[PDB]
Design a binder for these strands. Structure first.
Ligand SMILES: Nc1ncnc2c1ncn2[C@@H]1O[C@H](COP(=O)(O)O)[C@@H](O)[C@H]1O
Ligand SMILES: [Zn+2]
Length: 177
DNA sequence: GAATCATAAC
C-alpha cells in the first residue's frame, strides 16, 4: 500500500533493468524469479486490472505477447526449455503485467504453495487464451474461485504426480531435466 | 525437527 507496491513501476523506469524497450512496452527480469528465465512485460500506458480489459487493449495485448516471444528467443533460444506466457488472475503488484516463465521451475525464489499454484493452475491464464477472449468477447472471462486454487495440493506439471511439499516437489522436478 | 501457515511490517 506504500513504496513496495510501486516497485515494478520504479524498476521499469530504471534503464539498467530494461531488458527490452519500445514505444508500447518495457520488459524487465523478475526480481524474485520462479524459474531460470522469468521476465515481466509491462505496458507504458498503465492498465489497472484484467477486469478492466476492452477491445481497445487487444492490439496492445498481442504486442505484449509478441514481445515476450521475442525476448524468449533472444535470451533463451539456446536453452532447450519450454516456456509459458500468461497472466495471474489476481495480481499482487499494481498494473497488469505479462509473465514469460520457463517451465523448469528451478529457482530458490519459488518457496511456497502459493507460487507453485500461481503458475500451475487455472489461476495462471495463458496469453493466447486471453487474446482470444478479448477477440471473441471483448472482455476476459475469469472464473470465480481463484483464491481456492492457490491452496490446492502440489501436483507436478510434467509427470502429473501429486507431491507433499515444496522440498519434495523441487527434488522431483530435478529429475525432469 | 522440519515444513507450513498466519500475520505484521512504524
Ligand atoms: N522490483 C521488482 N522488479 C521486478 N519484478 C518484481 C519487482 N517486485 C516484484 N516483482 C515481481 O513481480 C511479480 C508480481 O506479478 P503478479 O503476480 O502478476 O502480481 C512477482 O513475480 C515478483 O517477483
Ligand atoms: Zn513430474
Amino acid at each position: 500500500m506504500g513504496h513496495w507496491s510501486q516497485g515494478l513501476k520504479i524498476s521499469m523506469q530504471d534503464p539498467k533493468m530494461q531488458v527490452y524497450k519500445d514505444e508500447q512496452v518495457v520488459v524487465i527480469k523478475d526480481k524474485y524469479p520462479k524459474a531460470r528465465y522469468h521476465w515481466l512485460v509491462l505496458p507504458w500506458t498503465s492498465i489497472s486490472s484484467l477486469k478492466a480489459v476492452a477491445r481497445e487493449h487487444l492490439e496492445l495485448l498481442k504486442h505484449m505477447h509478441t514481445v515476450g516471444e521475442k525476448v524468449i528467443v533472444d535470451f533463451a533460444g539456446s536453452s532447450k526449455l519450454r516456456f509459458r506466457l500468461g497472466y495471474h488472475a489476481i495480481p499482487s503488484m499494481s498494473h497488469v503485467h505479462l509473465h514469460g516463465i520457463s517451465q523448469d521451475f528451478d529457482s530458490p525464489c519459488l518457496k511456497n504453495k502459493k507460487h507453485w499454484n500461481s503458475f500451475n493452475t487455472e489461476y495462471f491464464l495463458e496469453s493466447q487464451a486471453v487474446i482470444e477472449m478479448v477477440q471473441e468477447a471483448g472482455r476476459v472471462t475469469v472464473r470465480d474461485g481463484m483464491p481456492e486454487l492457490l491452496k490446492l495440493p502440489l501436483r507436478c506439471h510434467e509427470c502429473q504426480q501429486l507431491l507433499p511439499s515444496i522440498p519434495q516437489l523441487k527434488e522431483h522436478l530435478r529429475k525432469h531435466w
